[PDB]
UniProtKB/Swiss-Prot annotation:
Subcellular localization(s) per the UniProt record: Nucleus; Cytoplasm; Cytoplasm, Perinuclear region
Protein name per UniProt: Hypoxia-inducible factor 1-alpha inhibitor
Principal subcellular localization: nucleus
Effect of substituting I334R: No effect on dimer formation and HIF1A Asn hydroxylation activity
Pfam families membership: Cupin_8
Domain JmjC: 132-302
Start and end residues of each stretch annotated as Interaction with VHL: 1-115
Molecular-function annotations in GO: [protein]-asparagine 3-dioxygenase activity; ankyrin repeat binding; carboxylic acid binding; ferrous iron binding; NF-kappaB binding; Notch binding; oxygen sensor activity; peptidyl-aspartic acid 3-dioxygenase activity
Length: 339
């Protein structure tokens, strides 16, 4: 009963029926509990953010002008820039840090193109029945056209600037534009920055796990190209390699046009564009977190321990002269000593 997932789907204004239905949600092995949906003016929402717990805000007006966005308007106005477009064989996009692909030898799609090229490929695949999937993920730069600049100016900067300030966060590092095909899945990973995830078109189911479920989610090695992503395939979890995935409990919600999901720093998130829900548009706002206090306050937060583990992996990579030695050394350290 408390495993309520995203709950019974919302009704759209003017009796236009449910936004989505449970048939559009993929099916997974683990329980989940709802993320709260609150007004930005609600004290509890501020309490959640202050505490680095996720909340969905319903009424920020953060990206009000972008609500008109759709492929036709974007292609008319987004300029002649190149757009990074990731490709995939299945719904599951796994992403690669390319600087890290030298680290690792035994290793194996990004493509740059114009917006019109992107739309045409979707258009093609659509009327040709192909299985290929595409995800545009491009940070918004200055090539963008007159009307996009204008929309962007009309974002609710008063609100978000106030948050950055209330929270002591660092700088806004980027806005990423994401345009996905229905069914697209970004698998469980974590980011080291604070995120406002501003939904614009279509619906996305967001499954979050707290930083203290690191032991259940089995992130790739730091020097691996898939740094920060879970090794576990949620569709076919290998419980022999990943036994504690049997203990994983998530927080979930479905976001649509106008909702903002606060994804706290180091929270795992798994993001899926609803099946048969059409194309999805989202813009993220990433901020560096607050600086680390004084010296330290113990107990120590889960995300500080994650930070400790990343740094040990990184330093041992420098010291050994070879990221591949990390694992063999780590094992020599614990076997028969700490396990
Ligand atoms: O919306 C996505 O597909 C991914 C978002 C993220 O990783 O923040
Ligand atoms: Fe992310």
């Amino acid at each position: 009963a408390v495993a309520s997932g995203s709950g019974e789907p919302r009704e759209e204004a003017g009796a236009l029926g449910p936004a989505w239905d449970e048939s559009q949600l993929r099916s997974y092995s683990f329980p989940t509990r709802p993320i709260p949906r609150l007004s930005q003016s609600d004290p509890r929402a501020e309490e959640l953010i202050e505490n680095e717990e996720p909340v969905v805000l319903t009424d920020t007006n953060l990206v009000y002008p972008a609500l008109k966005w759709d492929l036709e308007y974007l292609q008319e106005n987004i300029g002649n820039g190149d757009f990074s477009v990731y490709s995939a064989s299945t719904h599951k996009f796994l992403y690669y840090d390319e600087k890290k692909m030298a680290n690792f030898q035994n290793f194996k799609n990004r493509e740059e193109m114009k917006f019109h090229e992107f739309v045409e490929k979707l258009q093609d695949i659509q009327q040709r029945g192909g299985e290929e999937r595409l995800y545009l993920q491009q940070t918004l730069n200055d090539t963008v056209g007159r009307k996009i600049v204008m929309d962007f100016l009309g974002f609710n900067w008063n609100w978000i600037n106030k948050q950055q300030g209330k929270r002591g966060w660092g700088q806004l590092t980027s806005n990423l534009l994401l345009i996905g095909m229905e069914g697209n899945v970004t698998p469980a990973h974590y980011d080291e920055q604070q995120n406002f995830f501003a939904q614009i078109k279509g619906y996305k189911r967001c499954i979050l796990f707290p930083p203290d479920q690191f032991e259940c989610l089995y992130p790739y090695p730091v020097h691996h190209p898939c740094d920060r992503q879970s090794q576990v395939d949620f569709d076919n979890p290998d419980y022999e390699r990943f036994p504690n995935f049997q203990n994983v409990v998530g927080y979930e919600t479905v976001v649509g046009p106008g909702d903002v999901l606060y994804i706290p720093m180091y929270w795992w998130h798994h993001i899926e564009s609803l099946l048969n829900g059409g194309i999805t548009i989202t813009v993220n706002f990433w901020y560096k977190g607050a600086p680390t206090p004084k010296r330290i306050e113990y107990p120590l937060k889960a995300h500080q321990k994650v930070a400790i583990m990343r740094n040990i992996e990184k330093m041992l990579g420098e010291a050994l002269g070879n990221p591949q030695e990390v694992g063999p050394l780590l094992n020599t350290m614990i076997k028969g000593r700490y396990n």
